[PDB]
Amino acid sequence: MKVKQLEDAVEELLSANYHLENAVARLKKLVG
Amino acid sequence: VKQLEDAVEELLSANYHLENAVARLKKLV
Amino acid sequence: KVKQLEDAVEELLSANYHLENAVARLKKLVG
Amino acid sequence: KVKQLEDAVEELLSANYHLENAVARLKKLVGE
């Protein structure tokens, strides 16, 4: 495993979390 | 309202597992 | 080690499960 | 506004795209 390959997996997860956080924030406001 | 609350709860569960993976893989890096 | 990678995969499978629950249900709401 | 919900859904599908990518990346590395 290259460290780059692990960093690239981590960057994918950060992208996932970005969108997930946006969706949660949006829904929290709709509940509000 | 109850449906949206349910969705939020599901997404907090998702966000938790996602961030566990991030934190621990960052430690591997 | 490979165990740390496998643990992360397990976490992400749980993440996917819960995310897909929310998507399926929000799609029904949109209807 | 229904667009609020549909935008949240779209964000979730974006999140799941990246999440699927991350899982596949890691599974490939598990099998090295």
Side-chain angles (χ1 to χ4, degrees):
Chain A
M1 170 182 252
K2 293 174 191 132
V3 299
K4 183 57 175 186
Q5 291 174 307
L6 186 51
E7 297 170 328
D8 274 350
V10 171
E11 194 176 11
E12 289 268 22
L13 291 181
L14 296 169
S15 287
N17 214 41
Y18 174 94
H19 291 293
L20 178 60
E21 306 172 320
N22 289 347
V24 165
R26 201 188 291 269
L27 299 177
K28 279 182 187 157
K29 296 309 185 42
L30 307 176
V31 165
Chain B
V1 195
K2 318 174 298 303
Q3 284 96 2
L4 293 170
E5 276 144 44
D6 180 68
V8 166
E9 294 165 338
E10 285 293 321
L11 298 174
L12 296 181
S13 283
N15 186 199
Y16 157 71
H17 286 291
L18 200 167
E19 292 191 359
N20 264 15
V22 170
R24 292 199 170 107
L25 295 173
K26 284 203 159 293
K27 289 162 192 159
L28 206 59
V29 173
Chain C
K1 70 271 184 51
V2 276
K3 176 171 260 201
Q4 296 183 72
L5 299 174
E6 292 182 314
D7 186 22
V9 168
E10 179 288 314
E11 294 275 16
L12 297 176
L13 299 175
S14 288
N16 173 254
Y17 164 72
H18 288 290
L19 182 159
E20 294 195 2
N21 280 349
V23 174
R25 289 180 172 121
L26 294 183
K27 281 173 146 55
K28 262 48 80 195
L29 265 186
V30 168
Chain D
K1 252 259 280 200
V2 291
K3 195 218 177 172
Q4 289 284 345
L5 290 186
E6 80 203 21
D7 281 355
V9 169
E10 184 180 57
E11 301 197 280
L12 289 179
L13 293 174
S14 279
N16 209 40
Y17 177 92
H18 293 288
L19 182 54
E20 289 174 341
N21 287 350
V23 165
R25 289 180 175 274
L26 298 166
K27 285 175 166 304
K28 279 285 151 197
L29 297 161
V30 167
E32 179 176 6

